């Protein structure tokens, strides 16, 4: 793991959800939402 290197977030409890911000400010918060989507190329690979 390295500093100054953007990373996307994943949670081990609920992989299907990803991190998003509701709003920016004091009253804002961070939350999880889905579905993760899927990238597929037929007969070779299919992953979230």
């Amino acid at each position: 793991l390295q500093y100054d290197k953007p990373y996307y977030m994943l949670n081990l409890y609920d992989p299907n959800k990803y991190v998003d911000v509701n709003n920016v400010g004091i009253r804002g918060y961070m939350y999880l939402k889905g579905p993760r989507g899927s990238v597929m190329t037929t007969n070779i690979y299919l992953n979230s």
């Binding site: 299907n16 889905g34 007969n43 070779i44």
Partner: protein
């Protein structure tokens, strides 16, 4: 949602929430209470089944009481219990979503005329002027009071997507104990609710659709017990893991048709109904919410998911065929005493339930009667083997099923459900309900008629041994001859396999009577130790599959290979496959593979290659499906017998445990009644015998886990050595044929050149790399489950693990072990960082902590361990108490004394183990561990990581003390961190691992074991010269640091960032010396350590150390460390000397 708990059996009828309705079309009427929108409870027996039925019409394993739920008090109890379970389920988020879904999953209205819809879900009042909307009504049980069930209002309407009402038979008062826990009735209610979901969405399968469950290996005939589709889809367990595979090896037309019908009725609603004003908007909203969740979501709901979400322990292996394995025993649950919103009060294991009166009424009609007979056909032994209530077919399902070559394969189970949206829907009033007359099928009770057959055997079967190991006599002689046990006409002996315990009892057969409590303690301890060495003993053996924990007593527990000298020798010379009866059971699945289409002959090279690639992918997927089918077949055929062995062995262990407890209790009662022992000694004897029985239970659980793991491994190895080679051979033939066909097809193509023909031929071959699906981790991970994790954490050896931290406002201190240990601590105890976490700071006068836990009382035969981090800040030689449990001079304790510690163990009889530990109180952290092992009778004391004491406590009897462990640390302020008490003895390897694991947290420690930090005035020392500090002296117009074989130099570390406080491993440092003006370090040309004044000229060294050493850090620069120089003694940056020279320390 809000469950209405303000209803009693005598509430007045309001025509809205509580009413009296009619079941089906019969003239029977009953009272119902609406608990939540569209869900009602009928606190009465089910009207459809007659309360009394003929004796031969009784279902085996079922309890029949026609007087149950009869009086109004029983009905009110049922109502309150059901409402309490409803509240418990609703409190959890997933249970609340399930309840909202059931509340909104109304059956589809029936279009009597185009544009005219009539409801199907309705209840008719007594005089037939009030109609009630209800998706589900929960009744009491039918004829059998333990038969929870759910039935549909109309068959066809619930089969073709329209949906019907559901009616539930529920038994909230009875539960059964599986292994070591009581099954939560909330989970059974959840299972019935999910079945009601299947009924409400009209996705009920055809009755003939049923996947196989077990192979009836008890019979001498080939027969498969197959489980219904809904039961398999919603039961969960390990069996559901052999069907829910990606890709699906088992598929049926039902899984295609059901979404079709769902979408059809969704279109019917959204086109015809949603735009129709003929019906109330309530039905519109209910249907909108019903159709918002598809059929896949309903399919993925099963008891494994709810067990994980609700944290409920459930059966996980063959959980729908328990009536053959687990002859249940029933316990009554008092919902005001033994239940609350959080399930069983004090867990599913630690709660106590009164045995139900109905256990004697359990009907026992066995599917088989096994009769052990001798040469002259005399009936020696007789036993009953029970069925499972599952349809048994005579045809092999695996040899008839056709794995679909052509199929299409593509979140939270109820993520789309909105509880708030469903709650906001106003209810359906009585004045806007137009019923449909033929909405109810005529209910017919179904009676299962079991068949009984006999078998005569010359060799005892496992059930013969299992039944011969139980007895009702209270004067038990544990014998060692099953033939003699059966032949014993006196009915006195009872069969057993505990050779150590039997031999010990034979040795003290002529021993003098136990007159005093000391002899009783000696006898009880010896009996416990012999029992634990008989039961928990295992032996590692190397078989054709690996290292396995062979448990030797199974041969004498289940009559498995008693012919040979020992169980292990037979297990090795015969292999795993010998542990079962029916060993050649695998048949080749019926498989069809589409040949290459001829229309591709006139295709270009690229298109032909792409089609061949698609064929290759489909063939690989088909081979994977064949492997999944083989895996399921191996389970259902071979692991069924091994799990029969598992359950039989666990039952044998429980029988032996009960026999031993009988012996203990009879001896204790005889001593109480026929001895001159003082009364207080009798009271303490009873209190100690209780704890000894608890420890015996724990040892039994250990043995059960051992046999479980051993047989699981044996079954996996059977799959290795017997099923996979057959799969490999069949797949080799199949790939050979497919390669031949593809090669011929390519050679027959016309639009392809010869070189391209060779290219395509070699590109689309099949070899062993395509059907090599074996994966040991998946085969051993089938048996992992949420039940296993919950049992593991509930029976965790950690009785106490103190955790401490600082929250803005206060400091939190407590137990993190999950047990019932209560903590009462003086609120003037601060927390300061110790080694890895916070540590309690004790003044030594008024700071007290008290840990209350039953196990802390200790006893005669409980092994335990105490370890922690101690840093004394005192100098008192007086024997001052530090920590321990001491009631009436009896117990264990540890006091400060001199500059070290004293460990004291005093039993009731006066025997005292007093040990002294030197050099412990030095303003430095020490990792103290004590391990009292009552099995081998060993006392181990470790300081830091050295075995400082290894004594024998063979002469220490009962040390029963108070449940309170008190941390006082008299007269010495001190730091105490990571206090931990386990109920298991600790070995040296575990102590070393814990020591290094806690220490190795990427922190740099000085000589005081504390945390080194920046901007702190330390003093440098060498590991070799720890007694000799570092001095600064002027020479050659410079200043140099050296030892003497001189003003001691003051050392500080500096970091680049001013936001860093402590010094972590593997980081840059600038060494600084405090002179009249501060100076920094540098390395000169001769690698000597020079003192400079320039701020930026000083270069950055690197700090590291070895994890094997607590605090001997090393300073390096550009790959070359700093080491002591030759005598002349300064420091040099050279690596042509011994390793000890690089080591350093700070103070």
């Amino acid at each position: 949602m809000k469950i209405n708990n303000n209803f009693n059996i005598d509430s007045l009828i309001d025509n809205r929430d509580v009413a009296i309705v009619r079941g089906r079309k019969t003239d029977t009427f009953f009272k119902v209470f609406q608990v939540a929108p569209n869900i009602w409870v009928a606190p009465e027996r089910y009207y459809g089944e007659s309360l009394n039925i003929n004796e031969d019409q009784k279902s085996d394993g079922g309890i029949y009481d026609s007087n149950f739920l009869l009086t109004n008090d029983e009905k009110d109890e049922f109502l309150q219990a059901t409402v309490k379970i409803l509240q418990r389920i609703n409190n959890n988020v997933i249970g609340a979503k399930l309840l909202s879904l059931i509340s909104t999953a109304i059956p589809f209205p029936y279009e009597y005329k185009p544009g005219d819809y009539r409801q199907t879900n309705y209840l008719v009042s007594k005089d037939n002027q009030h109609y009630y909307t209800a998706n589900l009504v929960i009744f009491g049980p039918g004829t059998n009071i333990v038969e929870n069930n759910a039935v549909y209002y109309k068959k066809e309407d619930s089969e073709n997507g329209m949906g019907t009402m559901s009616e539930i038979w529920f038994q909230p008062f009875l539960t059964y104990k599986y292994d070591q826990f009581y099954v939560d009735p909330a989970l059974e209610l959840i299972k019935c609710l999910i079945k009601s979901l299947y009924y409400l969405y009209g996705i009920k399968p055809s009755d003939d659709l049923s996947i196989p469950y077990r192979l009836r290996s008890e019979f001498n005939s080939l027969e498969y017990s197959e489980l219904d589709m809904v039961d398999f889809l919603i039961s969960g367990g390990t069996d559901y893991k052999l069907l829910n595979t990606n890709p699906y090896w088992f598929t049926d037309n039902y899984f295609i048709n059901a979404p079709k019908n769902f979408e059809k009725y969704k279109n019917d609603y959204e086109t015809k109904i949603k735009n129709n004003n003929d019906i109330a908007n309530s039905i519109k909203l209910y249907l909108e919410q019903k159709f918002k969740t598809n059929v896949q979501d309903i399919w993925e709901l099963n008891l494994s998911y709810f067990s994980t979400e609700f944290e409920i322990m459930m059966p996980e292996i063959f959980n729908n065929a328990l009536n053959h394995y687990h002859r249940k025993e029933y316990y009554v649950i008092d919902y005001f005493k033994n239940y609350n919103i959080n399930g069983f009060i004090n867990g599913q294991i630690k709660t106590i339930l009164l045995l139900s009166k109905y256990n004697k009424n359990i009907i026992n009609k066995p599917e088989l009667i096994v009769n052990l007979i001798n040469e002259n056909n005399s009936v020696l032994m007789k036993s009953n083997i029970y069925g499972d209530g599952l349809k048994g077919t005579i045809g092999n399902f695996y040899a008839v099923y056709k794995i679909p070559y052509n199929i299409g394969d593509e979140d939270s189970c109820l993520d789309n459900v909105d509880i708030k949206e469903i709650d906001n829907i106003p209810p359906i009033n009585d004045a806007d309900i137009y019923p449909y007359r033929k909405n109810c099928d005529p209910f017919t009770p179904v009676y299962n008629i079991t068949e009984t057959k006999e078998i005569n055997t010359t060799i005892p079967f496992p059930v013969n041994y299992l039944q011969a190991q139980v007895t009702n006599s209270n004067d038990i002689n544990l014998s060692s001859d099953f033939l003699k046990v059966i032949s014993s006409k006196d009915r006195s002996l009872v069969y057993s396999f505990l050779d150590n315990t039997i031999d010990y009892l034979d040795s003290i057969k002529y021993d003098g009577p136990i007159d005093t409590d000391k002899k009783y303690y000696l006898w009880l301890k010896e009996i416990f130790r012999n029992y634990s060495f008989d039961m928990t003993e295992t032996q590692e053996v190397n078989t054709l599959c690996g290292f396995n924990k062979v448990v030797p007593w199974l041969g004498k527990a289940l009559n498995i290979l008693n012919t040979g000298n020992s169980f292990i020798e037979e297990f090795k010379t015969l292999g795993p496959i010998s542990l079962i009866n029916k060993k050649e059971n695998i048949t080749m699945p019926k498989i069809e593979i589409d040949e290459i289409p001829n229309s591709m002959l006139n295709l270009s090279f690229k298109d032909l290659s792409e089609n061949l690639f698609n064929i290759f992918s489909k063939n690989n997927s088909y081979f994977e499906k064949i492997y999944y089918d083989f895996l399921d077949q191996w389970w259902t055929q071979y692991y069924s017998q091994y799990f029969d062995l598992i359950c039989m062995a666990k039952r044998s262990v429980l029988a032996q445990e009960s026999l031993i407890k009988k012996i203990i209790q009879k001896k204790l009662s005889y001593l109480i009644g026929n001895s001159n022992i003082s009364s207080d000694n009798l009271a303490l004897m009873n209190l100690t015998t209780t704890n000894t029985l608890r420890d015996i239970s724990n040892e039994s659980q250990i043995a059960m886990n051992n046999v479980n793991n051993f047989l699981n491994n044996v079954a996996i190895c059977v799959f290795q050595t017997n099923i996979y080679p057959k799969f490999i051979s069949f797949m080799e033939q199949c790939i050979n044929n497919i390669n031949k066909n593809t090669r011929e097809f390519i050679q027959k193509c016309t639009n392809i050149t010869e070189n391209e023909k060779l290219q395509l031929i070699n590109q689309n071959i099949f070899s062993s790399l395509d059907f090599d699906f074996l994966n040991i981790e998946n085969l051993k991970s089938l048996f992992n489950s949420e039940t296993g994790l919950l049992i593991k954490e509930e029976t965790s050896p950690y009785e106490l693990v103190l955790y401490a931290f600082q929250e803005p406002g206060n400091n939190a201190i407590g137990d993190a072990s999950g047990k019932n240990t209560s903590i009462e601590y003086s609120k003037d105890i601060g927390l300061v960082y110790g080694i890895n976490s916070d540590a309690l700071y004790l003044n030594g006068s008024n700071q007290s902590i008290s840990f209350s836990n039953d196990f802390f009382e200790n006893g005669l035969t409980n092994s335990f361990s105490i370890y922690f981090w101690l840093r004394n800040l005192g100098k008192d030689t007086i024997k001052s108490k530090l920590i321990g449990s001491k009631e009436d001079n009896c117990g264990w304790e540890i006091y400060f004394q001199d500059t070290g510690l004293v460990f004291n163990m005093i039993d009731s009889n006066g025997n005292e183990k007093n040990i002294y530990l030197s050099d412990v109180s030095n303003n430095s952290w020490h990792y103290i561990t004590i391990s009292v092992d009552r099995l081998k009778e060993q006392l181990l004391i470790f300081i830091d990581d050295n075995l400082v004491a290894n004594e024998s406590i063979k002469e220490i009897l009962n040390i029963y003390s108070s449940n309170i462990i008190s941390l006082l640390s008299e007269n010495n302020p001190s730091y105490i961190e990571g206090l931990t008490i386990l109920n298991k003895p600790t070995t040296s390897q575990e102590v070393l691992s814990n020591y290094f694991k806690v220490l190795n947290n990427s922190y740099i420690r000085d000589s005081s074991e504390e945390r080194l930090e920046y901007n702190k005035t330390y003093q440098l020392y060498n590991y070799v010269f720890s007694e000799n500090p570092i001095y600064e002296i002027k020479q050659n117009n410079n200043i140099y640091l050296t030892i003497n074989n001189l003003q001691v130099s003051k050392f500080k570390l500096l970091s680049i960032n001013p936001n860093k406080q402590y010094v972590q491993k593997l980081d840059e440092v600038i060494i600084s010396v405090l002179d009249n003006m501060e100076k920094y370090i540098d390395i000169s040309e001769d690698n000597r350590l020079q003192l400079i004044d320039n701020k930026n000229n000083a270069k950055k060294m690197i700090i590291s150390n070895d994890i094997f050493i607590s605090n001997c850090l090393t300073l390096s620069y550009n790959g070359k460390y700093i080491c002591l120089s030759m005598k002349d003694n300064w420091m040099i940056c050279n690596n042509d000397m011994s390793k000890y020279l690089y080591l350093w320390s700070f103070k």
